[PDB]
Amino acid sequence: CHGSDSHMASEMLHSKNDMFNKKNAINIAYDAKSLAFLSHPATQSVIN
Amino acid sequence: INALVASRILERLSTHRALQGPHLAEERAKMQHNAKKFEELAVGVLGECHGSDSHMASEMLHSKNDMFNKKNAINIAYDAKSLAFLSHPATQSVIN
Amino acid sequence: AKTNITALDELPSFALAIEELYKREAKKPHSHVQRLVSLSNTDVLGRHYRGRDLANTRAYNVLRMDQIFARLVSKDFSVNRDFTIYDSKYDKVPGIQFRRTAQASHMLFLWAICLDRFRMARHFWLIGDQSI
Amino acid sequence: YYALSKNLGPKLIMMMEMMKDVSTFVFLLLIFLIGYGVAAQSLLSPDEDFSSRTFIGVLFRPYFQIYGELFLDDLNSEANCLGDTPFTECSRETVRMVPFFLAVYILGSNVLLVNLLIAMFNDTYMKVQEAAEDLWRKQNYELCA
Amino acid sequence: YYALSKNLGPKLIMMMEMMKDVSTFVFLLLIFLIGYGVAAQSLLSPDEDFSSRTFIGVLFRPYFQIYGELFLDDLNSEANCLGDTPFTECSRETVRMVPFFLAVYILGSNVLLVNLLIAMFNDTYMKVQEAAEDLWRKQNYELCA
Amino acid sequence: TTFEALNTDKFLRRWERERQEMLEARVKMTNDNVVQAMGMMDQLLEHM
Amino acid sequence: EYKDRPFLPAPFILLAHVHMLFMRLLRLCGVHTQEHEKIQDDETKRKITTFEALNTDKFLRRWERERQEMLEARVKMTNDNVVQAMGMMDQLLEHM
Amino acid sequence: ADWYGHLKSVTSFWAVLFAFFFPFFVLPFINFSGAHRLRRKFAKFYSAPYTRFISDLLSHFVLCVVTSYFVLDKLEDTISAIEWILLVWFVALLLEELRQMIFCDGIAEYISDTWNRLDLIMITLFFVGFFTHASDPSNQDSKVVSKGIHAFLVVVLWLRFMR
Ligand SMILES: CC(C)CCC[C@@H](C)[C@H]1CC[C@H]2[C@@H]3CC=C4C[C@@H](O)CC[C@]4(C)[C@H]3CC[C@]12C
Ligand SMILES: CC(C)CCC[C@@H](C)[C@H]1CC[C@H]2[C@@H]3CC=C4C[C@@H](O)CC[C@]4(C)[C@H]3CC[C@]12C
Ligand SMILES: CC(C)CCC[C@@H](C)[C@H]1CC[C@H]2[C@@H]3CC=C4C[C@@H](O)CC[C@]4(C)[C@H]3CC[C@]12C
Ligand SMILES: CC(C)CCC[C@@H](C)[C@H]1CC[C@H]2[C@@H]3CC=C4C[C@@H](O)CC[C@]4(C)[C@H]3CC[C@]12C
Ligand SMILES: CC(C)CCC[C@@H](C)[C@H]1CC[C@H]2[C@@H]3CC=C4C[C@@H](O)CC[C@]4(C)[C@H]3CC[C@]12C
Ligand SMILES: CC(C)CCC[C@@H](C)[C@H]1CC[C@H]2[C@@H]3CC=C4C[C@@H](O)CC[C@]4(C)[C@H]3CC[C@]12C
Ligand SMILES: [Mg+2]
């Protein structure tokens, strides 16, 4: 996703999903204790 | 000289104001990578020269080129911040 | 067999097939799935309230499993299911076959996560959407 | 607030990881400190009733002698030895063993345990440097949130 | 003029690289030094007006105690404790906590931070040794020019 | 949703291509091809 | 070490010592006891023997399969197959 | 599994230590494995190697603290009560060492372990110091020589505590 279109990937990461009471994928990743996802440059770019 | 110029232009473009942006990161990386590769090429050709005839290679490294206001290739390499070219035994032999 | 619960009776055939798959997997000796269901302490709808015949003949339904997986993941998982789209009256809708596929794959995906069959899990993950 | 910085934050995470090694060092050091302190305190001042000062004497000098500040002048004064050479011509012959016990003790603490702690720190550092960077990126999100 | 030599020059480049790690150590050390110094200075001499001497007392002893020179005799003299055992029979009972704070402090500085600095130096050395040699060959050209 | 499913398909194609370019996989695939080649030679010898 | 040692701690282990001494005196002089002895049936012994030989065979099959999946073995086996393939081509050329 | 005996593997150091200190208040409310019920639970919990190992540690820790207290406190003009308690304690330790000597796989196997050698040094130092003091209890010099020997014992018992 970050390779194809970084801005569209950022829009994807900022998108609220109904399945976890309307909050985004990074919160889900933090709740899942996924260290690898959080350390990725795309996720870090969205956080910055 | 073309490999040093190519390495310098890609390195300067990778930190230029026109290349900063969230979507340009991979592009920047690619430029830096290509720069490094060209630097390696410049070392390789230089190494071949030193392998064939070291004295003639020294004459080549001491030759003044008109394209950078009449001064030699080692000054060009220093200006291009090419650490690999400067650390080569042929270049070090000319400096010694 | 027919059931008095309206929530259980609205469920399609493939959901009962996944329930049959869970039952078949559960019937094997020393299976961790049966231990998880027994330790969960929930009713037929998966609600944390802890008759008996309905609670034993249909102990491995998909809603209860959804509640158990929901409690394992986080504090706010609530999957919204719509089994009304599997009726023949919604056939004229263009994109319904993708959604219908996705939902089905998702339920089977969760079943494949429960039995720790990584290859099926990966395959059901491929067919559906919301990969990440 | 050091966690925002790319240098101070992962080093802080590595320091919190070392704390277990520091605690391990404290547990190993406790054996020599209590043993040498009770033994040395009894040898320096015998025939004395137990009090709170005895316990303070057990704890005070042994702990601070492993950092190189030796109380040998103070121990020489407490031993009541009047000779020009320090642990000679004493009233009791047993108190002359006080530097010998110490000789074993600082060999146990500085020569052996401190260098072992250095080895544990280098190994621990190499093991958890990448994990500290990953955990720092997670704590970056934690600060942002 | 050490840069011409094949031994002293790359080691100087490595030393300039370490300076960031030294600065990092100073930033970590500053927390304990200022905190322990203000706390310890207040405990030793209470009910005193603030002056420049208070600030000098905050900065002077904590910094030099991490290199093993302990001022325990000087702290004992300032605490006005007249007992044979040093931190006993004092006018105020709070000043007897002065060695305990110190006990935490040098554990923080010598046991924890210094050994961590040793680990950073070994890792940093292994990372930038080849780069130091390459940079030395560039500085060789710089001297020649 | 369309972007994410396209990038999912793209990653699977790239991952499959990368796993086929490994040395172990190439040696195994080359080995099976050489086994089938021996089978075809047996068929050729039968025709002879 | 701690399986055969008595349970009772050090000030109170004298009671345990005199209890063991009392049992030793009752067994040697008195001969009023006969301890405890438990055996195992032949069925479970043959079950352990059958299980162990099956797992031995399973490990040998897995070990053989693992040694055939190594890169060196595959290259060597591939090489011998290519040598036999050349032999079959020589036979084919003879037929031609 | 042999270590925990008939007990669940999730048991911690503090839980078993608390159950040892409070037998009638922590044992019925724990999960593991009438006269034949209470006796069965007591025989299962206390037959485990882990509980006796924890008891031996705690016992050796008390021995170190009490013996350390004994060496720091002044000797009396006769043999004190704490000296008699420590004498009974070290005989018991000596009998345990003899039991270890008889029931092992030879004298060589026993003496191979460094901790058994340390145990012999403990018993030898204590008896020399005790007989040195007990030879002339009113003599000040005997007390001084005895405390000098007993400094070495405290050093070995804290070293022996690392086992
Ligand atoms: C194996 C190790 C731990 C045991 C070491 C032996 C110790 C306990 C023995 C060996 C020699 C002994 C010393 C010999 C002579 C004297 C002089 C006397 O006026 C006071 C006691 C004193 C100072 C003895 C103290 C105890 C002593 C140090
Ligand atoms: C215990 C192991 C490590 C080694 C044993 C060495 C011990 C027993 C030795 C080494 C140094 C010795 C001391 C050296 C000097 C003197 C002064 C003398 O007038 C009385 C004995 C006395 C006080 C000795 C007692 C025994 C001693 C402490
Ligand atoms: C390489 C190193 C380990 C050498 C070993 C040093 C040993 C042998 C030396 C260093 C300091 C010495 C002690 C210094 C002072 C005294 C007091 C004196 O009244 C008796 C001997 C005694 C107790 C010495 C015993 C031997 C001693 C412990
Ligand atoms: C969690 C940590 C940081 C808190 C530690 C508790 C501190 C603040 C408390 C606990 C016990 C307290 C001490 C208890 C008794 C006395 C004696 C009194 O004559 C002077 C104050 C003094 C010396 C107190 C000072 C404050 C004290 C040390
Ligand atoms: C803060 C954490 C790390 C541990 C807490 C330990 C603190 C609160 C303890 C440890 C040592 C203690 C001190 C030890 C001795 C004395 C002398 C007494 O007459 C008054 C209290 C005083 C001055 C104590 C105050 C509290 C103290 C400082
Ligand atoms: C293994 C290491 C960490 C052991 C820990 C050492 C601790 C427990 C010891 C070492 C030095 C000791 C301090 C030394 C002196 C004094 C002054 C006295 O008036 C009160 C107690 C107090 C403040 C002590 C408290 C406990 C203390 C801090
Ligand atoms: Mg033993």
Numbering used by the authors:
A (entry chain D): 676 to 723
B (entry chain C): 628 to 723
C (entry chain D): 483 to 532, 546 to 627
D (entry chain D), E (entry chain C): 917 to 1061
F (entry chain D): 1110 to 1157
G (entry chain A): 1062 to 1157
H (entry chain A): 724 to 756, 787 to 916
What did the authors write?
A cation binding site is found between the MHR3/4 domain and the Rib helix of each subunit, termed MgMHR. The E1114A mutation had no obvious effect on macroscopic currents. However, single-channel analysis showed a small decrease in channel open probability and a small increase in channel close rate, revealing a regulatory role of this cation binding site on channel gating.
The slow kinetics of the NUDT9-H enzyme module confers a self-regulatory mechanism: ADPR binding triggers NUDT9-H tetramerization, promoting channel opening, while subsequent hydrolysis reduces local ADPR, inducing channel closure.
